[PDB]
Design a protein around this ligand. Structure first.
Ligand SMILES: Nc1ncnc2c1ncn2[C@@H]1O[C@H](COP(=O)(O)OP(=O)(O)OP(=O)(O)O)[C@@H](O)[C@H]1O
Ligand SMILES: Nc1ncnc2c1ncn2[C@@H]1O[C@H](COP(=O)(O)OP(=O)(O)OP(=O)(O)O)[C@@H](O)[C@H]1O
Ligand SMILES: [Mg+2]
Lengths: 14, 257, 117, 257, 14, 83
DNA sequence: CGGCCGCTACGTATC
């Protein structure tokens, strides 16, 4: 399943 | 260096899909359509914040033309002893407007203008018990005046604060509760940490009964301890040169508690 | 019960041939020191015959004494939470981890029983 | 889309003629004709604000060609830590005058002028306990000097605040208490929601003994929970396609409380 | 007996 | 307190002269068998003198031993209701 | 709407 890097979600967030 | 690449992976952070996160996102979608205020409660290491952040990273701001961003879900976190001006200030900044000098009535009138026009449906307040008792007047006011659902997130202490005021305790009576992992659910989750978060060179087989006894006594079912114990063990394993975790190295880490 | 089930001091049990006998009456032999497992006997030709070793589902790795399941059930009743095998285990493991003379006595009594093994 | 039309309708709001509301209007007409100041009190979900909006929306403002409006009843709701200026600011805006910058005595003088000009008979102050203690001097003054019945609405904390000033306590002594539904009255009211509010395609028979046990334990007799439980159950059951509410689906909504 | 929509009461008001 | 209030065992008391003494400390003298009325004494010239009788607002016609008021208060605090 | 079946709760007896 997909598991998200926590800093990547921050970089992608608006 | 191949070792350095992987050590930089383990000290990081990630969001794993789990049944509690998935339950909350279904429930909050029910509240966001109904425009009903509610609260989320549970013990301090259950992952209420990561479950709310995963909901803030769904429902992204829709930018258009030269209009203000359409933000369906606003998530803020107050500072300790948060006053009425501190709440409006953070709402105004999160929606990307600059706050200037004025008095209380001005922050309020301005907060209602940016909440209008710009498409807010839900406001999520983390650590709700940092709010000063009077600010709840402004939280209720918004929830009743604008079709905005307000969600209060927190620990059991939050309810001890809320029960001090009937007026609040009744707008926010509906709740969802986060629990601890057990039985098959703790065992199944240990495999996801191994196969999706750790991804060690060869498999440590943490679902095996002796590794589960060590992990059960260590973690007590808290996802915020499972995430912590296994990174600490995997960093120790790799920096000592092991291709996996083993009974003695995991007991060395768990003995720190 | 249908689905091959036995429910007993709030704990629910599953057994290897037990689904063959839903609706029937069974004689259950158990240890007050360890109620995770139940020996199931049934009446046939007006004699007891052994049937199976039923086990508390999801507790096969775990040991509950009857006074612990009882104290957890009392606390669980008064706490207003739901009845289940883990829910009872959850109402044990806090009161375990967190003392009261009976529990302090039980710990010294246990240490003697350990030296018997 | 017939479903989406009902989800858009049911998340809305209504006012129902109930005994508690008919009782308040007969009482407030008595206080308005006699010009006597008084208070309305009771637990936070009894529906006191809806009962007062049903009063304000009867007794409509009267218009005479080029005169200021004749306004028999004023309902205002103060912000938190309301000061003398904030009360006067709101009364002035409600009678449709823009408030220009001035000292507290300019706001006082202009407020007295517009109350006497618009022919106000009654002033209703909701959530009265948001008032700062000194402002009651100006509320007592409005009621002493002008022929105005001030009505304070609040809950049991308002009495704990009124009892800290002898001058307010001995003036606002007359009162009506909003109470909870029970027995035949709760039973009869559940039928009024089924037939006048919910509009489901087949009878849900909510007044039956197997259903009243569910609804009694959920609502505790509060009209503000009854409307909330029964809208949430209607929204939810229509999104699954049933023409009713039934035992298990209502126990799903009630298990959130 | 008559029941009222909160928003219709708002629309009918002064 | 302001407006002549005293607080004692969670009951709030008021009386015939107390408002003129706001901010001063008074010696409450009371009977544990019935706390619905309290005698209030004050110190003047280092001599204690009688001031007034203070009555628990809204229950002047009832009776309460201190044990009833204390036990009921624990039930209210445990229940989580206001007092 | 009515009847049958597991888990709690009250009453009684004894060391
Ligand atoms: N789905 C998940 N995937 C990965 N890690 C997770 C997940 N859920 C929780 N965690 C981890 O669990 C730990 C608990 O932190 P988190 O902020 O989620 O807890 P919390 O219960 O919200 O805490 P608090 O009540 O103090 O705010 C963190 O290390 C977090 O990264
Ligand atoms: N007479 C009524 N007819 C229809 N719906 C009602 C009625 N009274 C209350 N409700 C419903 O229940 C809710 C009760 O909230 P309401 O604002 O009336 O209570 P309140 O007593 O003013 O509360 P508080 O004292 O906490 O401000 C309303 O918002 C509405 O949805
Ligand atoms: Mg109200």
């Amino acid at each position: 399943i997909e598991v998200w890097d926590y800093e990547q979600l921050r970089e992608e967030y608006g | 260096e191949w070792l350095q690449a992987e050590i930089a992976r383990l000290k990081g952070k990630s969001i794993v899909p789990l049944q509690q996160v998935k339950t909350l996102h279904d429930w909050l979608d029910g509240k966001r359509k109904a425009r009903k205020s509610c609260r989320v409660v549970g013990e301090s290491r259950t992952g209420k914040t990561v479950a709310c952040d995963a909901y803030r990273y769904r429902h992204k701001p829709q930018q258009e033309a030269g209009r203000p961003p359409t933000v369906p879900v606003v998530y803020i976190r107050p500072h300790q002893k948060c006053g009425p001006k501190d709440l409006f200030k953070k709402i105004t900044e999160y929606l990307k407007y600059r706050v200037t000098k004025g008095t209380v009535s001005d922050f309020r009138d301005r907060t209602i203008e940016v909440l209008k026009g710009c498409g807010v449906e839900m406001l999520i307040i983390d650590e709700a018990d940092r709010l000063k008792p009077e600010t709840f007047a402004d939280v209720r006011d918004i929830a009743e005046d604008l079709g905005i659902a307000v969600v209060l997130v927190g620990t059991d202490r939050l309810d001890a604060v809320i029960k001090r005021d009937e007026q609040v305790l009744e707008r926010f009576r509906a709740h969802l509760r986060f629990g601890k992992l057990s039985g098959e659910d703790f065992k199944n989750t240990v495999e996801m940490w191994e196969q999706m978060v750790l991804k060690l060179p060869v498999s440590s087989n943490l679902k095996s009964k002796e590794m589960l006894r060590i992990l059960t006594s260590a973690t007590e079912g808290y996802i915020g301890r499972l995430d912590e114990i296994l990174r600490e063990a995997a960093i120790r394993s790799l920096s000592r040169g092991l291709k996996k975790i083993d009974k003695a190295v995991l007991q060395e880490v768990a003995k720190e508690y | 019960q249908r689905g091959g089930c036995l429910q007993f001091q709030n704990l629910m049990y599953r057994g290897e041939y037990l689904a063959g006998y839903a609706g029937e009456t069974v004689n259950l032999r158990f240890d007050p020191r360890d109620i995770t497992t139940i020996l199931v006997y049934r009446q046939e030709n007006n004699q007891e015959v052994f049937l199976t070793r039923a086990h508390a589902q999801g507790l096969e790795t775990e040991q509950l004494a009857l006074d612990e399941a009882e104290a957890a059930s009392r606390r669980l009743r008064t706490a207003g939470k739901t009845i289940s095998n883990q829910s009872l285990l959850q109402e044990v493991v806090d009161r375990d981890a967190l003392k009261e003379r009976q529990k302090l006595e039980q710990t010294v009594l246990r240490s003697a029983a350990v030296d018997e093994s």
